[PDB]
C-alpha cells in the first residue's frame, strides 16, 4: 500500500506543480499588462498637468 501511495503522490504533486506553473504564467501576463498600464497613466497625469 505504501509503495502504491508514494508513487501515486509523486504524480499527484507533479500534476499540481504543472497546474501552479500554468497559473503563474497567466498572472505574469496580467502583471505585464498592469505594469504597462500604470506607466502610461502616470505619464498622462504629468503631460496634462504641464499642458
Amino acid at each position: 500500500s505504501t509503495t502504491s501511495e508514494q508513487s501515486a503522490r509523486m504524480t499527484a504533486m507533479d500534476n499540481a506543480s504543472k497546474n501552479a506553473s500554468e497559473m503563474i504564467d497567466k498572472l505574469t501576463l496580467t502583471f505585464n499588462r498592469t505594469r504597462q498600464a500604470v506607466i502610461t497613466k502616470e505619464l498622462i497625469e504629468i503631460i496634462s498637468g504641464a499642458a
Binding site: 499527484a12 499540481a16 497546474n19 501552479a20 497559473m23 496634462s48 499642458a51
Partner: protein
C-alpha cells in the same frame, strides 16, 4: 440676427454675431447646406463669438458661411403621432414615410423633476428570467441598468426584456438607439412591423423609435439620448399613461461627450474623460424617472470599457440605478447565458419586507454557496475536486448545479441555440433553487440543470441520460 463661421474643427464650430447673441443651448441653422445642419450653442467665448457643436458632419463648411439663430433650443415632434415612426437627433423623420405632423413640439433640453415630484412606490416586475427574478428583481417604474463588456449579451438581454414585459404592459414604449449598430435598428423595426406592435397601415402602433447610431459624429451621439428621452417624457406627464424606456447603449452618450470635450478646450479628467462627466450624466439621468404624475420603467444597456467596471463611465452610472444586472465574460465563456454575475447584480427591493422571507432567504442561500465555491476555486485548480473534504465536495456539486440552473434559453436566442424559449414564473423559480439548496437533487447529473426552464425540466432531462 445673422452669424458667420470663424472656426471649424470636427463637431466643434465657432460662430460670430454682429448684433444679438444666441443664448447657450440654442439651435442654429447653417445656410448653404443641402441637408439641415443644426449647431447647438455650448459656450459663449466672448467678443461676440459662440462655441457650438454640430448634429451632423461638418465637411463642406467654409469660414464666412452664414448661420441663423432659431430662437429656441432643438425642438422635436412629441405626441401620439410619433408612435410607429423613426426619427433622428433633431426630430427629423428617417423612415421615408413623410412629415411627422404633431400638434405639440418640445425642446430636447429640460430641467429634471423636483424632489416633491418623486414617488416612493416599489413593486416587483416579474421578468420571467431566473437570475433576475431570484437575485436582483426589477421594479415597476424603477430604473434598470444592464452592465457588460464587448459581446457578453447586453443587447440580447434588453431585446428579451422587451419581449417579456412590453406585451403584458398596456401602454406606450420608447426605444433609443444610441451609438450602436444600425443593422440592429433595421432588425428591430421590421420585426416590430412583423409582429404588429408597429403599424404602417394603422395608428395602433405602441412603440416610438429614435436613432443615432455609431455612424454619426459625436454631436449626434451626445444628444440623441435626450431626443428619445423627450418623447418618453411627454407620455409620462401629459397623459398619465405608463411608459417603458429602452436605451441601447447609454455609454455612447458619455463617450461622445468625451470626443467633443477634447475640442472644446477643456482640461481632461482621469482616463482622458471630460471634467463634467458626472454632472453631464446627472442632468441627463435625472430626467429618466417616475413622478407622482406618471411612471417610467427604464431599462438601459451600459457598455463597460475594456471590461473595467471601475472606469469612470460605468462606475458613475451605478448611483442612478434601482436594479443592476452585471454581465461577466468568464461566466459567458463557461457557456452560461444570460451571463449574469450572481455576486455583482443588486436590487433595492431585495428585502424580506418587500419580496417575502422565503424569497429573500433562498436568494441569499444561492449567493452564500456560490461565494463559498468561488473561495475554493484556487485549491480546485491546483490539486483537484477529489482533494476536498466531504463538506466542501457537497457544496461544490450543489453550487455547480445552481450555476447551470441559473442559465436560461431566451426567445430572442431561438436561433443561436436552436432550443425553445422559456418563461419561468417567480414561485417556480424560488421553489427550484430552494430544493437544490436543501439537497433534493444531489443524485442528478450537472448537465441536466444546464439551459432549462422550471425545475421539472431538469428532472425530465435527466431521464434521457439514464
Amino acid at each position: 440676427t445673422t452669424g458667420r463661421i470663424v472656426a471649424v474643427i470636427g463637431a466643434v464650430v465657432d460662430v460670430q454675431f454682429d448684433e444679438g447673441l444666441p443664448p447657450i443651448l440654442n439651435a442654429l441653422e447653417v445656410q448653404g447646406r443641402e441637408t439641415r445642419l443644426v449647431l447647438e450653442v455650448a459656450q459663449h467665448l466672448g467678443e461676440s463669438t459662440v462655441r457650438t457643436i454640430a448634429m451632423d458632419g461638418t465637411e463642406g463648411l467654409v469660414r464666412g458661411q452664414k448661420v441663423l439663430d432659431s430662437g429656441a433650443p432643438i425642438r422635436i415632434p412629441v405626441g401620439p403621432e410619433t408612435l410607429g415612426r423613426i426619427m433622428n437627433v433633431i426630430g427629423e423623420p428617417i423612415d421615408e414615410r413623410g412629415p411627422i405632423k404633431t400638434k405639440q413640439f418640445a425642446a430636447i433640453h429640460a430641467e429634471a423633476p423636483e424632489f416633491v415630484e418623486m414617488s416612493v412606490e416599489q413593486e416587483i416586475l416579474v421578468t420571467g428570467i431566473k437570475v433576475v427574478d431570484l437575485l436582483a428583481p426589477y421594479a415597476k417604474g424603477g430604473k434598470i441598468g444592464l452592465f457588460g463588456g464587448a459581446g457578453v449579451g447586453k443587447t440580447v438581454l434588453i431585446m428579451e426584456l422587451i419581449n417579456n414585459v412590453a406585451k403584458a404592459h398596456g401602454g406606450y414604449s420608447v426605444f433609443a438607439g444610441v451609438g450602436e449598430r444600425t443593422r440592429e435598428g433595421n432588425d428591430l423595426y421590421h420585426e416590430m412591423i412583423e409582429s404588429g406592435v408597429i403599424n404602417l397601415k394603422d395608428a395602433t402602433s405602441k412603440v416610438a423609435l429614435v436613432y443615432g447610431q455609431m455612424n454619426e459624429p459625436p454631436g449626434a451621439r451626445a444628444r440623441v439620448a435626450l431626443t428619445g428621452l423627450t418623447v418618453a417624457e411627454y407620455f409620462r406627464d401629459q397623459e398619465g399613461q405608463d411608459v417603458l424606456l429602452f436605451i441601447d447603449n447609454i455609454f455612447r452618450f458619455t463617450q461622445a461627450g468625451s470626443e467633443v470635450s477634447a475640442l472644446l478646450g477643456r482640461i481632461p479628467s482621469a482616463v482622458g474623460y471630460q471634467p463634467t462627466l458626472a454632472t453631464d450624466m446627472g442632468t441627463m439621468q435625472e430626467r429618466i424617472t417616475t413622478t407622482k404624475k406618471g411612471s417610467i420603467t427604464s431599462v438601459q444597456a451600459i457598455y463597460v470599457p475594456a471590461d473595467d467596471l471601475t472606469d469612470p463611465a460605468p462606475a458613475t452610472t451605478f448611483a442612478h440605478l434601482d436594479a443592476t444586472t452585471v454581465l461577466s465574460r468568464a461566466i459567458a465563456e463557461l457557456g452560461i447565458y444570460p451571463a449574469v454575475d450572481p455576486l455583482d447584480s443588486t436590487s433595492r427591493i431585495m428585502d424580506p419586507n418587500i419580496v417575502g422571507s422565503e424569497h429573500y432567504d433562498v436568494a441569499r442561500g444561492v449567493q452564500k454557496i456560490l461565494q463559498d465555491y468561488k473561495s475554493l476555486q484556487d485549491i480546485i485548480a491546483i490539486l483537484g475536486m477529489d482533494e476536498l473534504s466531504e463538506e466542501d465536495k457537497l457544496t461544490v456539486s450543489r453550487a455547480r448545479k445552481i450555476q447551470r440552473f441559473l442559465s436560461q434559453p431566451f426567445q430572442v436566442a431561438e436561433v443561436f441555440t436552436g432550443h425553445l424559449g422559456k418563461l419561468v414564473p417567480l414561485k417556480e423559480t424560488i421553489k427550484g433553487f430552494q430544493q437544490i439548496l436543501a439537497g433534493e437533487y444531489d443524485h442528478l447529473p450537472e448537465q441536466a440543470f444546464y439551459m432549462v426552464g422550471p425545475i421539472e425540466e431538469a428532472v425530465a432531462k435527466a431521464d434521457k441520460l439514464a
